[PDB]
Amino acid sequence: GLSDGEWQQVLNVWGKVEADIAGHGQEVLIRLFTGHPETLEKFDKFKHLKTEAEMKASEDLKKHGTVVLTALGGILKKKGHHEAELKPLAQSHATKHKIPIKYLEFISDAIIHVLHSKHPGDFGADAQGAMTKALELFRNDIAAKYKELGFQ
Ligand code: HEM
C-alpha cells in the first residue's frame, strides 16, 4: 500500500530508468547474476556467460533486461492495480521458469543497488523508500500467487 506521494516518487525514479531502459536492465541483470550466481542457472540462454565481461558484451542480456524492466515499468505504472499484468508473470515465473521468491528479492535489491550506482546522490532517501515499497508490493503480490500455486 503506497500513498499517492509514494507512487509519485516511484514514477519519478522510473523516469530515470526509462531514459536508458536497456542500460538499467543490463546492469540489473548483471548485478543479479554476479551477486547471486545461482540465478544465472535459471537462464538456459545466459548460463554460458562465465565472466562479467561476457555478460556486459551480451546483446541478448541487454535485450532481456529491456524485456524485464519494460514489464516491471508497466506494472509500476498501474500504481498497485496490476493484477492483470502481474498474474502471467507470477504464473510463468512459478510454473515455467521455477523462480523462487528469494530471487525476486535479489532482483529487487539489485534494482536499488543499480539506481544508486547509476544515479549516485540522485536517488534520495524518500525515493529509495518509495521504490522499495513498490518492489515489496510487487514481490508480495507475486508471493500470494506463488502460495496459491504451492510453489516454493
Ligand atoms: C522484476 C522482476 C522480474 C520481471 C518483471 C520479469 C519479467 C520477465 C518477463 C516479462 C519474461 C518473459 C515473459 C515470461 O516468460 O513471462 C521473463 C522471462 C524469464 N524470467 Fe523473469 N522477470 C523478473 C525476475 C526474474 C528473476 C529474478 C529470474 C531468475 C533469477 C527470472 C527468470 C526468468 C527466466 C529464466 C525467463 C525466461 C527467459 C528466456 O529463456 O527467454 N525472472 N521475465
From Swiss-Prot:
Its main location: cytoplasm. It is found in: Cytoplasm, Sarcoplasm. Its EC number is 1.7.-.-, 1.11.1.-. GO terms for biological process: oxygen transport; removal of superoxide radicals. The modification Phosphoserine is found at S3. It comes from the Eukaryota. CDD domains: Mb. GO terms for cellular component: sarcoplasm. O2 binds at H64. Residues 1-147 form the Globin domain. It catalyses: Fe(III)-heme b-[protein] + nitric oxide + H2O = Fe(II)-heme b-[protein] + nitrite + 2 H(+); H2O2 + AH2 = A + 2 H2O. GO terms for molecular function: heme binding; metal ion binding; nitrite reductase activity; oxygen binding; oxygen carrier activity; peroxidase activity. Signal peptide: none annotated. Keywords: Cytoplasm, Heme, Iron, Metal-binding, Muscle protein, Oxidoreductase, Oxygen transport, Phosphoprotein, Transport. It holds the Pfam family Globin. Heme b binds at H93. Nitrite binds at H64. InterPro entries: Globin, Globin-like_sf, Myoglobin. Monomeric heme protein which primary function is to store oxygen and facilitate its diffusion within muscle tissues. Reversibly binds oxygen through a pentacoordinated heme iron and enables its timely and efficient release as needed during periods of heightened demand. Depending on the oxidative conditions of tissues and cells, and in addition to its ability to bind oxygen, it also has a nitrite reductase activity whereby it regulates the production of bioactive nitric oxide. Belongs to the globin family. Monomeric. This is Myoglobin. It comes from Equus caballus (Horse).
